[model samples]
Target: MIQMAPPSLNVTKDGDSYSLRWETMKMRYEHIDHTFEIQYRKDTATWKDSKTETLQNAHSMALPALEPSTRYWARVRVRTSRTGYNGIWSEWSEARSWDTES
Candidate 1:
């Protein structure tokens, strides 16, 4: 068995939040059953896990609680069942960054 591959992360600033998206989200709805783990932070110091449940295979999510005029980095990874994802997680994709609106 093999683990699902990670997706290339993309991010953008939306009004007051950062929107994160990845191709894997589409791949999931198109037919794979897997959940994603997303994380972000104001800097390279530490990352905060997104509380938004991505179980519904969402292509994009918003991080609305972060500060303004700040540069943030985020990443995404995958996880699934033992029979599907091999009961493990793939490595996190390249982290993407966006500067929040001031």
Candidate 2:
């Protein structure tokens, strides 16, 4: 089994909310058993699970409203179950941080 690395994550501000985008070039199984987990937090606060989504051949998600003028960090990881074999969760992506506009 080949351990995969995290995806390249990015973010954009949209009004009072944020949109996250990520992509991976790793080999994916044909089945729909692969999924991704999105996590985020404010500054050094404990990480929170934002959501888990099944891979849809595309990678993008919208985040809930966050505190204005606060800095946030986010990352993504993936897991897969192909051909009746379970796969391990990939390492979390490098954290992407940005300050929310007031």
Which is the leading candidate under TM-score? 2
What would you estimate as the lDDT of candidate 2?
0.70
Q: Model 2 compared with the native: what TM-score?
A: 0.76
lDDT of 2 by residue, 21-67 (tens): 88777755465545677777777465653334444445867777466
lDDT of 1 by residue, 3-94 (tens): 45777788865456668877763244345556677777666346644343353355566776677776777777766532444456777768
Q: After superposition, how far is residue 35 of candidate 1 from its true place, in Å?
A: 0.5
List TM-scores for all candidates, in order.
Answer: 0.70, 0.76
Clashing residue pairs for model 2: none
Pairs clashing in candidate 1? Answer: none
